Amino acid sequence: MQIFVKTLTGKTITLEVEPSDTIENVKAKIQDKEGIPPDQQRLIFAGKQLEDGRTLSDYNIQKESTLHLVLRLRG
Amino acid sequence: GPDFDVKRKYFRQELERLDEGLRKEDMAVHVRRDHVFEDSYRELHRKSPEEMKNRLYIVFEGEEGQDAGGLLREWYMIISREMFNPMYALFRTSPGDRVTYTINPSSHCNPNHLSYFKFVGRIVAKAVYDNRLLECYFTRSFYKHILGKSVRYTDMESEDYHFYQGLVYLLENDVSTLGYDLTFSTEVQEFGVCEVRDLKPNGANILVTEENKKEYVHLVCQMRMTGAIRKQLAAFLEGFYEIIPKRLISIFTEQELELLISGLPTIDIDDLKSNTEYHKYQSNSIQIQWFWRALRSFDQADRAKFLQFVTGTSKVPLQGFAALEGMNGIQKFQIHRDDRSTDRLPSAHTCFNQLDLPAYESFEKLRHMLLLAIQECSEGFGLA
């Protein structure tokens, strides 16, 4: 299954994941494709922040879904 | 330069004379980032002028950021960019080299536009009252209206350079040589077929000739620049003057008023470098040498994103980087070494103008990590 992670500038990152994958797993697959440590990543879907313990199916993230990546860098 | 400082010294002093006897309080502004203009309008457009002079602090919904100054600077920046979003039909872009904005004559598209124009004028005046900076750029016509100066037809060169240079040709040449016709009316592009507004009593039935072309040039510019937006200007200036009195703001020139609202027109890395502080690193540490090399390798658009990253706004204060403001007083740009890990992206605390920079192992990695952070996190507060 392919999902899309959209960055602030609009760049798209295509991932190969399964509905049983955890949000922590998806953040790790982004680290290998963009070099960003997971503890600096925050994923948004349908206006809700995704907790690391939940799976994709727990958020009803089906095929070709688009997630939003925001970075936790500024205070 | 120095003459500008003399005006601002008098300007700020008289502003502080007028709020003697005001028990100022901290006033919260709860907004969503994707609705920052609508939310701030709901939260502030019914505040009294005395209430508007309170110290605002911003709470972005769903964001860990705590406003000690850095969130307010970003709020001013992103709200000033959303006021000119054409989706609100409040403003339009003036055609030219540098992009400036004009009041949209079709603003009754939005039924409550006069309410929003007064709010936009309030925000601009509030930004000047707070000594904060906006990403606003107006035409010479608009600045003259704020300064109470009379608008001349020569000011059309800044509003519309090519339309103005069509008027010089009409004045310079004969109407028999144009190849088209002109009447004493101007077009109403409100999605109607040949709906026009008269520049004169029964002006649509009067042809422009050599006997009256000078009167036409004068009448069309007063319309394009004040008549067509008369009600929207009055609403804007009403909200603006409620906070900054007209007698005080009018001491400035159009160029000075633009600098007062937008700050310095460029980002000088050399000026930033001579006003930088370091904690755990030294001015000659290798990552600091790589940092300045990377910052200098950025174009004007990317160094703006960097300024937003560490301070909250893309704008430079008028006194330069030696006057960068923090929480209590002046806090220069500072770089702290991040010892946690070298695989982390750089982080920033916009309230202290502080950049947490990991001890990267190569110039290529530092430049890549820095550009990724400032481009993919130019806005948004994920940390406290």
Residue numbers in the entry:
A (entry chain C): 1 to 75
B (entry chain A): 3991 to 4374
How does the study describe this entry?
HUWE1 regulates diverse cellular processes, including protein quality control, DNA repair, and transcription; its deregulation is linked to tumorigenesis and neurodevelopmental disorders, with disease-associated mutations accumulating in the C-terminal catalytic HECT domain. This ∼45-kDa domain consists of an N-terminal lobe (N-lobe), which recruits the ubiquitin-loaded E2, and a C-terminal lobe (C-lobe), which harbors a catalytic cysteine, interacts with the donor ubiquitin, and can encode specificity in isopeptide linkage formation between the donor and an acceptor ubiquitin. A flexible interlobe linker enables rearrangements of the HECT domain during catalysis: for ubiquitin transfer from the E2 to the E3, the lobes adopt a particular “inverted T” conformation, whereas the transfer of ubiquitin from the E3 to a substrate requires an “L”-conformation with specific interlobe contacts. Here, we employ ubiquitin-propargylamine (Ub-Prg)7,8 to reconstitute and structurally characterize the interaction between the human HECT ligase HUWE1 and active site-linked “donor” ubiquitin.
